[PDB]
Structure formats: structure tokens, C-alpha cells
């Protein structure tokens, strides 16, 4: 009865292969190197530690922040592992000497997330004081103050296709602030909850979006609501999408619901376990991003255990 | 030979009675190796 | 002595849960290019 019901997309279920637990505190960010060798992941212990992307062993430990590290954006166009700390300091720890090289400032409060633009030499630092900041890389100065949010700008997206910068505001209103002007070119007539999640699928479609309650898709030219999300009412914090058509949603309740970017039905919708030292209701996917080789999924939970989920071939998972 | 005759306890041969050391991390910060050493070294 | 549950049965026997503490490449291998 539903449109496009008997022809969904293909999505085999995944399986956890290794649960690395070396950090001391809730991991708030996780990122993979573009060479598929390093895995940068912060923690609540104010130490952004890099590990092996495939072996899983520890590779380095780089501290320096005065608060929780809630952002780690490894730059692919330049060797600089920039990080956003909650101590009002976007510590751009360059990996050329494993130390701070820039130490840019300007935000009045904690920084929510950071995203490096693929084309423009600037870093979109989504702060949480009242707005975001367009920090210029290798200049140590801000470009423009894109103040278009009534609350903290949690999510951030710097796409080369979208001319504006998609900012995710916690005031239940997403915005697309232009890079040259700075004003929000178009708002979002959706996401009734506090929107603190955003994704992008540039493989064969436009960039989507997300929300904790009543999430929906979008489009890159000026926004276009394609379809809403499934029955996921938990507080979503991680939203990753692969080029093969997989859509991973990481919520705070631990229910890592995996759906399709085209079909929309939840393929796996499995819930992860917790650490023995942790509490009963403490496991929650705060950050999740796929690998550079798009083989083993990586989700950093809140139970101080960076879990890695590999793939597995199966055929008895037909959805009605 | 014949140097330890009145020894009550012969040999313990067990430091932690489960392994040579802890070698296991836990999310509980109080019941970990960090708080066990900080309550034994700095405190007395 | 101590008393705590083991992590082998909680996270499953399949997923080899590793716990790395420290002492691996003290800011030399990802810092500079390796000696080719």
C-alpha cells in the first residue's frame, strides 16, 4: 500500500568487531584520517588521543585543553588535526609537530563542533555562546560572525555544493547562512525539537538533515523536505551516512538505529551494550562516523569505550 | 638447609591471588588503579 | 584483593575488546614523516 514499499534498498547488518576502551570519561567526538590509518577521538579527560584506524591500538596522546573536548575535525586538505574544546578555545593542534600551532580564540563560551571547508580556506567553528564563527585557517582571525541562531548552534556543515553554510541551531530552526554575506538565506520549517544533528550524502543525492524528535530529509539547493524519519524518538546526537546507501543514527539512549537513505526503513535497529564499570543506563552514541575505506563503522559511545562495528554478509533480512 | 625451622608461614607465592597485577580498566573512577594508588601514596 | 565483573562476557567473546593505556609513539611517528 505504501509507495516504493516492495522495492527497498539493500543493506546487510553489521557486527561489532572490537571495542577499544582506553579513554577516561565520555567520548564526545570521533574522526578518521583520510588515509585510513589514524583515528582521532577526544574524551572528557581533556586529551585528544589518536589510535590506529585498522589495528585499534593506541598511537598518540595529545592533551592541552582545559575542558571537555567536544570536537575533533581532522583536515584532509592540510596536515592539521584541529580540535574544538569547551574552554572557549579552538585549539588547532597541527600534526606537523604534535603541538598547538594556532590557538585561535574569539568565542564567548564552549564550542559545539568544528567543520573544515573542502574548498574555502576557513574553519566553521560552531560555538555555543550565541552563534558560530568563520575562523580563517593560517590567519588566526575570524572572517564573519554568522549570527542567525536564537540558541546554541550545535551542528555545522560546510559543503562545496551548498553555497551557504548549513548551521544546526538548538532553537528548533535550522539555517543556511551564506559565506560571503553571513545572513541566513533560508530557514527550516521542520525539526520541532532542538536540532543538534546534521548529515550529508553526496554520493548520489543532496545533503540530508536530522533532528532528535520528528527528523526529516532535506535538499542542498534552498532546502526541500523529501520524507520524514522513522520511529526514533530518542535524543539523536550522531547522524552518519555512507556512500553505499546506509544511514546510521546515533542516539543518546543507546538505540543505534540504522536505516536506509533511500528506503527509510530501519535495517538493523540494534542496541549496543555497556561497560562493566559503567552504570546500567549510561551507554549512548555521542559521535559516529564511517571509516575512510567505508568498511568498518566507528561509533564512540558515552561509556568510555570507542566501539568499532565491522560488516557481515547475510541474506535473511528481508523487510516487508 | 635447616635455616628456617620455626617459620609459621612457609611461602605465600601469591601477590594479588588472581594475576601478577590488575591489567584491567574499569569505568568506575573510584574503583580503579588510579584512585587506589592516590589513596595509598598521597594518603596514609 | 578486589571484586568486579569481567568485561569478556559483557561485550561478548567475539569482539576482542582491547584496553590500551599508554607508551606508544611519543609524538614522533605522526609528528614528522617516517624515515623512508
UniProtKB/Swiss-Prot annotation, chain A:
Please state what the protein is called: Pleiotropic regulator 1
List GO terms (cellular component aspect).
catalytic step 2 spliceosome; fibrillar center; nuclear membrane; nuclear speck; nucleoplasm; nucleus; Prp19 complex; spliceosomal complex
Protein role: Involved in pre-mRNA splicing as component of the spliceosome. Component of the PRP19-CDC5L complex that forms an integral part of the spliceosome and is required for activating pre-mRNA splicing. As a component of the minor spliceosome, involved in the splicing of U12-type introns in pre-mRNAs.
Query: What does the UniProt keyword field contain?
Result: Acetylation, mRNA processing, mRNA splicing, Nucleus, Phosphoprotein, Repeat, Spliceosome, WD repeat
Where, per the database record, does this protein carry Phosphoserine? 21, 211
Please report the residue spans annotated as repeat (WD). Answer: 22-61, 64-103, 106-145, 148-187, 190-230, 231-269, 280-319
What's the family?
A: Belongs to the WD repeat PRL1/PRL2 family.
Instruction: List the source organism.
Output: Homo sapiens (Human)
**What does UniProt list as this organism's lineage?**
Eukaryota, Metazoa, Chordata, Craniata, Vertebrata
Q: Which gene encodes it?
A: PLRG1
Q: Which cysteines share a disulfide bond?
A: none
List the range of the whole protein covered here: 181 to 500 of 514
Q: Which GO terms describe its biological process?
A: mRNA splicing, via spliceosome; positive regulation of G1/S transition of mitotic cell cycle; protein localization to nucleus
Intracellular or extracellular location(s): Nucleus; Nucleus speckle
Swiss-Prot record, chain B:
User: What is the purpose of this protein?
Assistant: Involved in pre-mRNA splicing as component of the spliceosome. Component of the PRP19-CDC5L complex that forms an integral part of the spliceosome and is required for activating pre-mRNA splicing. As a component of the minor spliceosome, involved in the splicing of U12-type introns in pre-mRNAs.
Q: Where in the cell is it found?
A: Nucleus
**Species lineage, top-down?**
Eukaryota, Metazoa, Chordata, Craniata, Vertebrata
What gene is this protein translated from?
CWC15
Name the source's superkingdom.
Eukaryota
Q: What is the organism field in this record?
A: Homo sapiens (Human)
Task: Write out the similarity annotation.
Answer: Belongs to the CWC15 family.
Q: Tell me the protein's name.
A: Spliceosome-associated protein CWC15 homolog
- Self-association or partners: how does it assemble? Identified in the spliceosome C complex. Component of the PRP19-CDC5L splicing complex composed of a core complex comprising a homotetramer of PRPF19, CDC5L, PLRG1 and BCAS2, and at least three less stably associated proteins CTNNBL1, CWC15 and HSPA8. Interacts directly with CTNNBL1 in the complex. Component of the minor spliceosome, which splices U12-type introns.
Swiss-Prot record, chain C:
Source organism superkingdom: Eukaryota
Q: Which residues constitute the cross-link Glycyl lysine isopeptide (Lys-Gly) (interchain with G-Cter in SUMO1)? A: 2
Give the position(s) of the covalent cross-link described as Glycyl lysine isopeptide (Lys-Gly) (interchain with G-Cter in SUMO2).
2
Q: Which residues carry this modification: Phosphothreonine?
A: 24
**Entry's localization field:** Nucleus
What does this gene product do? Required for pre-mRNA splicing as component of the spliceosome, including pre-catalytic, catalytic and post-catalytic spliceosomal complexes. Component of the U5 snRNP and the U4/U6-U5 tri-snRNP complex, a building block of the spliceosome. As a component of the minor spliceosome, involved in the splicing of U12-type introns in pre-mRNAs.
What protein family does this chain belong to?
Belongs to the TRAFAC class translation factor GTPase superfamily. Classic translation factor GTPase family. EF-G/EF-2 subfamily.
Q: How does it assemble?
A: Component of the U5 snRNP and the U4/U6-U5 tri-snRNP complex, a building block of the spliceosome. The U4/U6-U5 tri-snRNP complex is composed of the U4, U6 and U5 snRNAs and at least PRPF3, PRPF4, PRPF6, PRPF8, PRPF31, SNRNP200, TXNL4A, SNRNP40, DDX23, CD2BP2, PPIH, SNU13, EFTUD2, SART1 and USP39. Component of the pre-catalytic, catalytic and post-catalytic spliceosome complexes. Component of the minor spliceosome, which splices U12-type introns. Within this complex, interacts with CRIPT. Interacts with ERBB4 and PRPF8. Interacts with PIH1D1.
**Associated clinical condition:** Mandibulofacial dysostosis with microcephaly: A rare syndrome characterized by progressive microcephaly, midface and malar hypoplasia, micrognathia, microtia, dysplastic ears, preauricular skin tags, significant developmental delay, and speech delay. Many patients have major sequelae, including choanal atresia that results in respiratory difficulties, conductive hearing loss, and cleft palate.
The protein, known as: 116 kDa U5 small nuclear ribonucleoprotein component
Q: What is the lineage of its organism?
A: Eukaryota, Metazoa, Chordata, Craniata, Vertebrata
Q: Which residues of the full protein are shown?
A: 63 to 98 of 972
